[PDB]
Design a protein around this nucleic acid. Structure first.
Ligand SMILES: [K+]
Ligand SMILES: [K+]
Ligand SMILES: [K+]
Ligand SMILES: [K+]
Ligand SMILES: [K+]
Ligand SMILES: [K+]
Ligand SMILES: [K+]
Ligand SMILES: [K+]
Ligand SMILES: [K+]
Ligand SMILES: [Mg+2]
Ligand SMILES: [Mg+2]
Ligand SMILES: [Mg+2]
Ligand SMILES: [Mg+2]
Ligand SMILES: [Mg+2]
Ligand SMILES: [Mg+2]
Ligand SMILES: [Mg+2]
Ligand SMILES: [Mg+2]
Ligand SMILES: [Mg+2]
Ligand SMILES: [Mg+2]
Ligand SMILES: [Mg+2]
Ligand SMILES: [Mg+2]
Ligand SMILES: [Mg+2]
Ligand SMILES: [Mg+2]
Ligand SMILES: [Mg+2]
Ligand SMILES: [Mg+2]
Ligand SMILES: [Mg+2]
Ligand SMILES: [Mg+2]
Ligand SMILES: [Mg+2]
Ligand SMILES: [Mg+2]
Ligand SMILES: [Mg+2]
Ligand SMILES: [Mg+2]
Ligand SMILES: [Mg+2]
Ligand SMILES: [Mg+2]
Ligand SMILES: [Mg+2]
Ligand SMILES: [Mg+2]
Ligand SMILES: [Mg+2]
Ligand SMILES: [Mg+2]
Ligand SMILES: [Mg+2]
Ligand SMILES: [Mg+2]
Ligand SMILES: [Mg+2]
Ligand SMILES: [Mg+2]
Ligand SMILES: [Mg+2]
Ligand SMILES: [Mg+2]
Ligand SMILES: [Mg+2]
Ligand SMILES: [Mg+2]
Ligand SMILES: [Mg+2]
Ligand SMILES: [Mg+2]
Ligand SMILES: [Mg+2]
Ligand SMILES: [Mg+2]
Ligand SMILES: [Mg+2]
Ligand SMILES: [Mg+2]
Ligand SMILES: [Mg+2]
Ligand SMILES: [Mg+2]
Ligand SMILES: [Mg+2]
Ligand SMILES: [Mg+2]
Ligand SMILES: [Mg+2]
Ligand SMILES: [Mg+2]
Ligand SMILES: [Mg+2]
Ligand SMILES: [Mg+2]
Ligand SMILES: [Mg+2]
Ligand SMILES: [Mg+2]
Ligand SMILES: [Mg+2]
Ligand SMILES: [Mg+2]
Ligand SMILES: [Mg+2]
Ligand SMILES: [Mg+2]
Ligand SMILES: [Zn+2]
Lengths: 252, 102, 58
RNA sequence: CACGGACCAAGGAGUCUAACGUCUAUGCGAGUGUUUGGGUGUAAAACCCAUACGCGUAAUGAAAGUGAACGUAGGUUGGGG
RNA sequence: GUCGAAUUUGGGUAUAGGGGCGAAAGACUAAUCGAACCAUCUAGUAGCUGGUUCCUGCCGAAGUUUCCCUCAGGAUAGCAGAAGCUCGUAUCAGUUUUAUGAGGUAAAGCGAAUGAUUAGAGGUUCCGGGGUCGAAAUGACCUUGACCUAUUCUCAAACUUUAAAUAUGUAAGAAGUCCUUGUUACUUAAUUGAACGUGGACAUUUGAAUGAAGAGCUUUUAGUGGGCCAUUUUUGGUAAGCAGAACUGGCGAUGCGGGAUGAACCGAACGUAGAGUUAAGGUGCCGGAAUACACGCUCAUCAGACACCACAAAAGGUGUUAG
RNA sequence: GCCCUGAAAAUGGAUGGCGCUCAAGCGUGUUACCUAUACUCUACCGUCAGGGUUGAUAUGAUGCCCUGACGAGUAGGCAGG
RNA sequence: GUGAUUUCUGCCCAGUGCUCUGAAUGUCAAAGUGAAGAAAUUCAACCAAGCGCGGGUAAACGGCGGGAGUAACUAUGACU
RNA sequence: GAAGACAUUGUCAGGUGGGGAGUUUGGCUGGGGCGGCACAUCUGUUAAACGAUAACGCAGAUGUCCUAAGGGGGGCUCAUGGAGAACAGAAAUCUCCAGUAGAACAAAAGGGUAAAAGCCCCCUUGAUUUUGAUUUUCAGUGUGAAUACAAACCAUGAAAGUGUGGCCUAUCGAUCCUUUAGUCCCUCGGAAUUUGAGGCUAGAGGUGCCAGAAAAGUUACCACAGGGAUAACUGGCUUGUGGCAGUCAAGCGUUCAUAGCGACAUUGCUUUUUGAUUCUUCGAUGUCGGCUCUUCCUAUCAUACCGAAGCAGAAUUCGGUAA
RNA sequence: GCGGAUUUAGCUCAGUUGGGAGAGCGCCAGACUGAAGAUCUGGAGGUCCUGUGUUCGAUCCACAGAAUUCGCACCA
RNA sequence: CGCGGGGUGGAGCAGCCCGGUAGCUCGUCGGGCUCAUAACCCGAAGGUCGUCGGUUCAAAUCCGGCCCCCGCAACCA
RNA sequence: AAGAAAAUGUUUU
């Protein structure tokens, strides 16, 4: 009879992200004439920690081509990028780690990061620590690039979409056990109010579909239809299968 | 029960008004028509919000229905109706009883 | 919570308070159930008797 | 050894209305109802009034419709006076 | 318990009621939480609980019938009041008698039917066959079982020939008995009959008894629709101050005298008084009234002492009494 | 027949109590006596009923008067106050 | 969902769920189409998803019985 | 830059949708539940010889079945027994005799029935039409069932007659809606025709909770109105059961019924068992046990004093007065 | 405590109608073998749990006990 | 109310989809194979196809019902 | 180029 927790999250009162300490949105440069036709050289001034983000950010300063001033950009630092390094962004930039190139300007097998889903969105794909996108092919006519995403999905993107050569820094982060409720607490204190999590079976029927009973148990299948409604989508939503995953991925 | 056809019985057809031969059939209700005033009223009542607006009978107890014979006079075609007692198996065809069979 | 089921107790006393009334016999009882053929002929006979006694007044 | 009641004062519960059944009183009576309204006034009173309208004087039928004296408005039995 | 981090805490800020918030207790959300508070709808509805305000006079119930999503309610009939009305040369009646029906309970019956049921006897050894011989039969016995015959003991709510008592229908006149002959489309072979008529005779007991604050008629409404008790009939139950019926009388609704006491038992029902007499019950004293009269019986180291009723049995006793 | 044995329950206690032994017990018989709101008679109240009396000084005919019977009451009805 | 570590997580997809095929289609709305009719209308074909059918899935919900026979004392059955 | 008449958006339509809303989730009842149906009914009995009459009384039955197992007629006579006839015996078919029904009649039971109501055969559709009256249940409403006629048309028989379903007593269903038959009748209201619709009369599709709502749970989170009309204590009635005690005395006890026991029976007491009941208490009598403490009972374990013994002593057993 | 059931050749079971007592397995023999084992044939095997009970008799007609167990109850 | 899937040797099934016609496996029995046993191979028995009519030259096969079982769709007395 | 199935046999002489 009560609005369940996953329903309450959408109102965004206490479930908003804790963004106070964050350095700013990590984005590529705005796609401009210099990047569309040649390249522009920036300088990596600082490699800094972003609160709530595993990957470090790189503050990169470019000259403004149209006004005498500097423009600071917040890239997601690729591993091996250092302070004082010159970053080259544009169609004519070299195939060096940290450079920002259009997807169509790199050969097959290139490893890129912070890849734009569309040209000029300034980076959407392979942004988390240790992640990267692989260029697996080009279709020059109707200019598109086929890429492999961290999840293993194959995606077709415009060849004018940009990416940073290399892998996002900070990889291996999840290999260390948190070892402590307090460490999970401090992790999520800087992300959002999603921790700790009460099990639905530990609640009452009013609070959750899984609540109630003289034993803790789901009672009905935890696999929930894709067409179910809000307040019903607790458990395994639209699960194709359940159980300990035995077998191969990358289905043909 | 076994009821024969051909039924010589009274006819009220205003031309016979007397015992004539009748053809016997089993009466079937016939399709419920739209545009019957009750159906029109029911559809209008059902339209919109409010859900089901009239009873839907559920507590069925009868296991039979009363068989109605339609008696059509062979001369004037006037039809009469005769209700029988409740029966579980009704047949109009022949195969009459035989006495002394093994 | 069960209760009493039936009794005729006090019923004869109630009946006799206003008494068992005999059914007030009348001369010329009604002809309600009489055979209709007899009634038809009786009507014709009575009409004929009435006409005869009307002419008999001299 | 069921419930309310320590005590006292004051307050405290079948009312009014619309439409009705029976009965009764009254007026008039095949009619009845002046009071919507009008006239008038000593001014929310009293007094006066046309046309309608309501009920009644006719019933019956789903309806179209039809529509109440053979007779001293009947015969018989009883019937107060 | 914990006490240096999932720590404690101020202030600011956000989330608001089928909403929030919840390290999850249905916890917390201003002493309010399995849905806050405030106002209004709202005097919400209640077959349920409580209350319901002066006097006297007269009459005076029901807890039963039928129907109901009915079983703590209602409708309906009944019981009750009121208003009367038409008559009163009068009618009827919780009654008897006489005449005439109906009944299948009590009882009775089972050498009468059905069904139970004890025993012996006489025949089917064909008996159901066996035992035993019989060389072997049933051949001869015995047998247990049945069958048949005449007997015999005992039974029946769902057996019965018979068959009460109580209870019960009808009649006991003038709307009667009889006689003559008119109508009909009914009926008859037919004025044959049927029914209804016209005319005529029959009042002291007009056709048993007793009674009759009269009889008949109508309208309209109240309450009630939990009952219970006693004698008798009676069902279930070991039984019950149990549960369920029949008839009547009661209590409820009722005081009074008696049973010490007590709703129901006995007696008797009630305006205010006086006198007399009684009922039931009593009369040593409490306590009004004989420590009356009479014939017996009883002695109890648990005597007994008035029905309902407030308990006692089988079995025993040279106690004592009478047979 | 009476008495006794049979005959054991919890606060101290009940032929009602006291007490009673040719009873003040049990069975039976005869009288006298006591006393209910009952019965009889009388008065008074009311109710109901049947009657008399508009013939005068008559203002109370809803009055006055005569006669007889009757009186319990919850729920409830009605009446007069 | 489970609940440090260690060790291990068996069998079962028939059911209820969840999730993907084949549609020489079964079910099948409104609109649309055809016929009949003076029309209202009726009838018919077509007919989306869904359902149905088929497949997958249990660290989804869950389930994990019974009987028969069979070892050279018996018993029990490794076995069928 | 992408995208493109596709998304989107608007309306309708199908699916999905406890996420959410609203609601419901019988009755009787020896508390309620579970069970059952005593809820609509029928036979016999309870039932007390008119009628009526209750219980979750007793023994059973009903929601069907039948074109004949309805209607008419004719002929015949059944169960069973005995005596006979190849296979054939205890049972097959044939014969006679006896045969009051001991058979059969759809079903439960009761009644009824012998030239039949049964068995067999022949002909049939009265299991029809019209609308009334009547009996039972009963309010003298409905429904079901049934009775006797009338007015038709028929069946059967030589005929008188009989037949308006089943030999009788059970076998069933309102309003509204739908549907069919009938009337070719009424209406569609400015006037017509034709469709369509609506009426009038009779049926049918159904309510079994059977006078007839359309309806799943859970609450140990609970709420309210109430109920001692009603359960879970004590108390009260009862005392089956429990416990305790008698009588008789077949037997046991080597012999001997009774030292001590005691079968088959049978009479009781008690209320420290458990039931049965539902009278008190539901506007509340604090719900186990223990601890503590007092008192009472005696059906006495011990102690006192005794009687008996299958009492030599010792030990023991039975019993008495004794709390 | 109460209500049920089972008491049977050595072991596991069927009985029976007011009769008997059988089946397997076991055991003893015979076929078979050089001799055996198996496999085949056979045979013997109970005084029917105990006491009384009606009978002409009786495991069985038909009663009270003992055991072996199944189930229900024993404080609110 | 409607529409489907069916029903076939003792058991479980094919055959139907436009009729030359009833078979398969398991189970029973017998035979063969092997030196012998098991496995294996074959044959026999076992049903006339749920039922009643019809279309048909002749029906398991088609067409209408009837019985039984299962499933699905629809829902004002 | 290559070519399915084939289990078992009591103890002591
Ligand atoms: K749960
Ligand atoms: K609506
Ligand atoms: K599964
Ligand atoms: K599945
Ligand atoms: K839902
Ligand atoms: K609920
Ligand atoms: K007892
Ligand atoms: K209480
Ligand atoms: K050897
Ligand atoms: Mg923000
Ligand atoms: Mg977690
Ligand atoms: Mg958790
Ligand atoms: Mg919890
Ligand atoms: Mg929920
Ligand atoms: Mg769910
Ligand atoms: Mg729990
Ligand atoms: Mg509309
Ligand atoms: Mg709609
Ligand atoms: Mg009552
Ligand atoms: Mg008291
Ligand atoms: Mg109270
Ligand atoms: Mg008080
Ligand atoms: Mg006052
Ligand atoms: Mg909880
Ligand atoms: Mg009020
Ligand atoms: Mg009185
Ligand atoms: Mg009350
Ligand atoms: Mg009788
Ligand atoms: Mg007798
Ligand atoms: Mg009372
Ligand atoms: Mg009295
Ligand atoms: Mg007394
Ligand atoms: Mg006096
Ligand atoms: Mg004195
Ligand atoms: Mg004695
Ligand atoms: Mg004594
Ligand atoms: Mg005295
Ligand atoms: Mg004396
Ligand atoms: Mg007077
Ligand atoms: Mg009085
Ligand atoms: Mg663990
Ligand atoms: Mg369509
Ligand atoms: Mg589709
Ligand atoms: Mg809900
Ligand atoms: Mg109930
Ligand atoms: Mg009677
Ligand atoms: Mg005859
Ligand atoms: Mg009936
Ligand atoms: Mg006739
Ligand atoms: Mg008849
Ligand atoms: Mg009907
Ligand atoms: Mg209609
Ligand atoms: Mg018009
Ligand atoms: Mg009813
Ligand atoms: Mg009580
Ligand atoms: Mg109790
Ligand atoms: Mg006892
Ligand atoms: Mg009672
Ligand atoms: Mg109190
Ligand atoms: Mg208290
Ligand atoms: Mg107290
Ligand atoms: Mg003693
Ligand atoms: Mg050997
Ligand atoms: Mg072989
Ligand atoms: Mg070898
Ligand atoms: Zn005709």
């Amino acid at each position: 009879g009560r609005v369940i927790r996953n329903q309450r999250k959408g109102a965004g009162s206490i479930f908003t992200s804790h963004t106070r300490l964050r350095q700013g949105a990590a984005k590529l440069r705005t796609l401009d004439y210099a990047e569309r036709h040649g390249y522009i050289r920036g300088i990596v001034k600082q490699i800094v920690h972003d609160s709530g983000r595993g990957a470090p950010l790189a503050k990169v300063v470019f000259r403004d081509p149209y006004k005498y001033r500097l423009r600071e950009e917040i890239f997601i630092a690729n591993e091996g990028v250092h302070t004082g390094q010159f970053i080259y962004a544009g169609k004519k930039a070299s195939l060096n780690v940290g450079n920002v190139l259009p997807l169509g300007s790199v050969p097959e097998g290139t490893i890129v990061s912070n890849v734009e889903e569309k040209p000029g969105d300034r980076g959407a794909l392979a942004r988390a620590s240790g992640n990267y996108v692989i260029i697996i092919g080009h279709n020059p006519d109707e200019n598109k690039t086929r890429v492999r995403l961290p999840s293993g999905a194959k995606k077709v993107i415009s060849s004018d979409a940009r990416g940073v050569i290399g892998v996002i820094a900070g990889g291996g982060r999840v290999d260390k056990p948190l070892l402590k409720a307090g460490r999970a607490f401090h992790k999520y204190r800087l992300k959002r109010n999603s921790w700790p999590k009460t099990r639905g079976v530990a609640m009452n029927p009013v609070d959750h579909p899984h609540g109630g009973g003289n034993h803790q148990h789901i009672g009905k299948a935890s696999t929930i239809s894709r067409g179910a409604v809000s307040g019903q989508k607790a458990g395994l939503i639209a699960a194709r299968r359940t159980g300990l995953l035995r077998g191969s991925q990358k289905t043909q | 029960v076994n009821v024969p056809k051909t039924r010589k019985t009274y006819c009220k057809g205003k031309t016979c008004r007397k015992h004539t031969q009748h053809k016997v059939t089993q009466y079937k209700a016939g399709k419920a028509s739209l545009f019957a005033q009750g159906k029109r009223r029911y559809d209008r009542k059902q339209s919109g919000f409010g859900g089901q607006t009239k009873p839907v009978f559920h507590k069925k107890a009868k296991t039979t229905k009363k068989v109605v014979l339609r008696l059509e006079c062979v001369k004037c075609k006037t039809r009469a109706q005769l209700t029988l007692k409740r029966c579980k198996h009704f047949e109009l065809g022949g195969e009459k009883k035989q006495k002394g069979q093994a | 919570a069960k209760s009493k089921n039936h009794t005729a107790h006090n019923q004869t006393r109630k009946a006799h308070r206003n008494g068992i009334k005999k059914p007030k016999t009348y001369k010329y009882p009604s002809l309600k159930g009489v055979d209709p053929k007899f009634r038809r002929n009786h009507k014709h006979a009575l009409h004929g008797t009435a006409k005869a006694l009307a002419a008999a007044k001299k």
